[PDB]
Amino acid sequence: LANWHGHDYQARYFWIEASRLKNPQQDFVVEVSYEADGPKAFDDVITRYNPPRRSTGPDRIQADYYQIAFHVTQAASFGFEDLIDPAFIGAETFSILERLKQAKGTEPANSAFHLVTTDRIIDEDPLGEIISNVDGSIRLDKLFDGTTDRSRKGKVRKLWRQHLKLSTDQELEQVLSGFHIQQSQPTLEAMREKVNTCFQIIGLITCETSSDFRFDGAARALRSQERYRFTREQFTALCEEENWIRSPESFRNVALRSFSDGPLDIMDALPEHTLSLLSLFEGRFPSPGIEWNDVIKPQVETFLTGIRQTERKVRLYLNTHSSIAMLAGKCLGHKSGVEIELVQKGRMGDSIWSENESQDEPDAVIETETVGTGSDVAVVLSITRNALPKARAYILENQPDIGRIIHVTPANGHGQRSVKNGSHAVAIAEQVSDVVMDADLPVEASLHIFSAAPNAVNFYLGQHTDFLGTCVFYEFDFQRQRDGSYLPSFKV
Ligand SMILES: [Mg+2]
């Protein structure tokens, strides 16, 4: 059949959004539309809300509008000059800013407009100063300086104002309200994992082992069928007809995040069940160190203690730093009565973790080694990569009191897929706990945890840190070049 103009990237975006129609915890998502015969004005996908959705802003928002830049396998970059050039959205006629202005006249005041691209903002392009790290919103306080066209912001104002045949910067401000640029959005491959993860959670079938993805077909079929928009009733109707309904066992959705809130992920849990740390730091995340222990740790503990004493089942959406994921695990540990479903979200993509699926994996390889007389111990988990060298360097250089490095590598070596599931993660966790308890640390001593693992494994290991006493958690940071080095984060 005839592809969508946005092709499979656009269909997958559509599927993630359409999923909300069958999600009981987002009952306010009342329609999802696509336009596959485009591009037009910010309507590649539209998601409509009733009641209008929660906003950062002063008005509850009736719909999100998406213009999606044609995915290419080769990464590119773009700047403020690209927003007035049609070539960039790959038409001969109307620029994204022209489509925005167009969309701003036809659509209700309380609308949000999003340019979606896998590309990044060029280094030091003024666009990067006017696009919020939090939510991609245009930063109007930064673009509208009160300066004249001569300023660094002025040049951007002037290119855009004159492109849109507007007379004043005040009118350019009005057209740019509700505009968002979502840069470095997930790859096509990662979008496939985002679809599957969204579909499993709402109790639909996934498509895993195949190299063709059944929903890219179903998308094309829906186009030839001329079915472009779906209510909650219409989407459920569709799921029945296609035989997609697997079932769901209801968890409270909770969200812990410390990176950019892309609109794909921003509504994962209600706001009272969402802790977005980059938000709290107005888009400027502190370096690893005492601010983590003094400000972040209380924010996380207070929030997850709130969850723990009301919720018996938690679907924790996790997109955060390693030591925060590990802190999350401690607050919602073994001993707490919380059944946990983990949704691990990052740039590689989305996966679901639980202790449901079984495993008979070999014990991890555990090598201990002596480096001094001191009573402190390091445990180094090399799960994604080999962490020991860089841990050893940091420890020799900075931790005299450390006497023993316990190193933990999975059976089949470190690598993307080195841990199978939650039950394997939990096994390694117990295995590490036994080892660390068997090592008989005195009480006044500290266990130093160096982890190179994805969020879920750090969470499960965090679940066992009650058993290991005084613990120091570490962040691996690339502030020592391509090399990188470890800094201490949380002391628990
Ligand atoms: Mg488009």
What is d(CA 333, CA 305) in angstroms, rounded to the nearest whole number? 11
Give the Cβ contact number of residue 95 at 10 Å: 20
Q: What does the alpha-carbon distance between residue 186 and residue 347 come to, in Å, rounded to a whole number?
A: 6
For residues 265 and 343, membership in a common domain is answered with yes
- Distance between Cα 15 and ligand 1 center (Å): 16
What separation in Å is there between the alpha carbon of 241 and the centre of ligand 1? 29
Structure tokens at 231: 């209510």
The C-alpha angle with vertex 455 and arms to 451 and 460, in degrees rounded to 5, equals 80
Calpha distance 369→380 (Å, rounded): 12
Are 175 and 71 in a shared domain? yes
Interatomic CA distance for residues 310 and 307, integer angstroms: 6
* Cis? peptide before 86, omega within 30° of 0: no
| d(CA 459, ligand 1 centre) in Å | 38
Distance 85 CA to ligand 1 centre (A): 13
CB under 8 Å to 160, separation ≥6 — which residues? 80, 83, 84, 97, 172, 176
Q: In the chain, after which residues is the C-to-N distance over 2.5 Å, breaking the chain?
A: 247
| Bridge partners, residue 379, by sequence | 406, 449
Q: How far is the CA of 66 from the centre of ligand 1 (A)?
A: 8
Amino acid at 139: R
Quote the number of domains for the chain.
3
Whether residue 151 is contained in a domain is answered as yes
CA angle 29, 105, 170 (to 5 degrees): 110
Torsion of CA 478, 470, 444, 393, to 10 degrees: -20
> Where do we find the tokens 């498509």?
207
Q: What is the rounded distance in angstroms from the CA atom of residue 399 to the CA atom of residue 397?
A: 7
3-state secondary structure the chain: CCCCCCHHHHHHHHHHHHHHHHCHHHCCEEEEEECCCCCCCCCCEEEEEEEEECCCCCCCEEEEEEEECCCCCCCCEECCCHHHCHHHCCCCCCCHHHHHHHHHHHCCCCEEEEEECCCEECCCCCHHHHECCCCCEECHHHHCCCCCCCCHHHHHHHHHHHHCCCCCHHHHHHHHCCEEEECCCCCHHHHHHHHHHHHHHCCECCCCCCCCCHHHHHHHHHHHCCCCEECHHHHHHHHHHCCCECCCCCCEEEEEECCCCCCCCCCCCCHHHEEEHHHHCCCCCCCCCHHHHHHHHHHHHHHHHHHHCCCCEEEEEEECCHHHHHHHHHHCCCCCCCEEEEEECCCCCCEEECCCCCCCCCCCEEECCECCCCCEEEEEEECCCCCHHHHHHHHHHHCCCEEEEEEEECCCCCCCCCCCCHHHHHHHHHHHHHHHHHCCCCCCCCEEEEEECCHHHHHHHHCCHHHHCCEEEEEEECCCCCCCEEEEEEEC
Q: What is the 67 CA–ligand 1 centroid distance (Å)?
A: 5
CB 451: neighbour CB atoms within 10 A?
A: 26
For residue 452, list its beta bridge partners. 382
* 424 CB neighbour count, 10 Å cutoff: 23
In the listed set 148, 182, 216, which residue is the last one of a domain according to the structure? 182
Does the residue 433 lie in any domain? yes
Structure-token match 């096994």, residue found: 427
Q: How far is the CA of 448 from the centre of ligand 1 (A)?
A: 49
Given resolution (angstroms): 2.4
On whether the CB atoms of residues 271 and 54 are closer than 8 A, the answer is yes
Residues 14 and 137 placed together within one structural domain of the fold = yes
CB 328 within 8 A of CB 317: no
Q: Are 111 and 70 a contacting pair, CB within 8 Å? A: no
119, 54: one domain: yes
Residues 385/361, Cβ–Cβ less than 8 Å = no
255 forms beta bridges with 274, 317
Cα(492) to centroid of ligand 1, in Å?
Answer: 48
Q: Is residue 204 part of a domain?
A: no
69 shares its domain with 168: yes
For tokens 């555990």, the residue is 366
Alpha-carbon distance 241 to 395, whole Å?
Answer: 60
Residue 368 token pair: 């201990």
Task: Retrieve residue 75's tokens.
Answer: 């990464």
Residues 426 and 479 occupy one common structural domain = yes
Residue 36 and residue 173 in one domain: yes
Please compute, for residue 117, the number of CA atoms within 13 A of its CA located in the half-sphere on the CB side: 21
Distance 68 CA to ligand 1 centre (A): 5
In this structure, what are the phi and psi dihedrals at residue 114, rounded to the nearest 5 degrees? Answer: -130, 125
Sign, Cα dihedral of 298, 301, 302, 304 = positive
Extract the tokens encoding 488: 């201490």
Count of Cβ atoms closer than 10 Å to residue 258 Cβ: 20
Q: Ligand 1 centre and the CA of 41: distance in Å? A: 8
Q: Which residues contact 21 (CB under 8 A, 6 or more apart)?
A: 29, 31, 32, 230, 231, 232, 234, 235, 236
| Calpha distance 479→483 (Å, rounded) | 8
> What backbone torsions phi and psi does residue 35 show, to the nearest 5 degrees?
-115, 105
- The reply to whether 158 and 302 lie within a common domain is no
Instruction: Answer with the one of 353, 385, 416 that is the final residue of a domain.
Output: 353
- 189 in a domain, yes or no? no
Whether 212 maps to a domain, the answer reads no
Structure tokens at 66: 């998406």
351-353 and 376-382 as β-strands: parallel, antiparallel, unpaired?
Answer: unpaired
> Which experimental approach was used here?
X-ray
Residue entry with tokens 């209008």: 52
CA of 183 to the centre of ligand 1 (A): 14
Taking the mean position of all CA atoms in its chain, how far away is CA 90?
A: 28
Report CA(36)–ligand 1 centroid distance (Å): 9
> Cα–Cα distance between 381 and 416 in angstroms, integer?
14
Spatial distance between the Cα atoms of 380 and 393, rounded to a whole number of angstroms: 12
Nearest residue to 450 (alpha-carbon basis) of 483, 477, 423: 477
Cα-to-centroid distance, 269 and ligand 1 (Å): 28
Asked if residue 58 has a cis previous peptide bond (ω within 30° of 0), the answer is no
**Cα(45) to centroid of ligand 1, in Å?**
9
Radius of gyration of the chain, Cα coordinates, nearest whole angstrom: 24
Residues 339 and 397 in one domain: no
Tell me, yes or no, whether 382 and 482 share the same domain: yes
**Residue 14 counted as domain residue:** yes
CATH number at residue 397: 3.40.50
Tokens of 217: 């077909």
Instruction: Say whether both 39 and 172 belong to one domain.
Output: yes
Instruction: Classify strands 339-344 and 313-319 as parallel, antiparallel or unpaired.
Output: parallel
Task: Single out the residue in 353, 377, 397 at which a domain terminates.
Answer: 353
What is the extent of the structural domain holding 130? Answer: 7-182
Kindly give the distance from the C-alpha atom of residue 122 to the centroid of ligand 1, in angstroms, as a whole number: 20
Taking CB atoms within 8 Å and a gap of at least 24, the contacts of 203-208 are 203/22, 203/245, 203/246, 203/247, 203/248, 204/19, 204/22, 204/239, 204/244, 204/245, 204/246, 205/244, 205/246
Considering the domain boundaries, does residue 235 fall inside one? no
Bridge partners of 409, per DSSP, are 365
Question: Which residues lie near ion ligand 1 (Cβ < 5 Å)?
Answer: 39, 44, 67
Q: Tally the residues of the chain.
A: 492
Q: 178 alpha carbon to ligand 1 midpoint, in Å? A: 18
User: How far apart are the CA of 119 and the centre of ligand 1, in A?
Assistant: 14
Whether 377 and 324 map to the same domain: the answer is no
Q: How far is the CA of 191 from the centre of ligand 1 (A)?
A: 17
Rounded CA gap, 430 and 359, in Å? 14
* C-alpha–C-alpha distance, residues 335 and 341, integer Å: 16
Residue 89, classified by CB atoms within 10 Å of its CB into exposed (0-12), middle (13-18) or buried (19+), is buried
Side chain identity at residue 126, one-letter code: P
Longest Cα–Cα distance of the chain, Å, equals 75
Is position 130 within any domain?
yes
**Is the C-alpha dihedral spanning 286, 121, 130, 112 positive or negative?**
negative
Measure 44 CA to ligand 1 centroid, in angstroms. 6
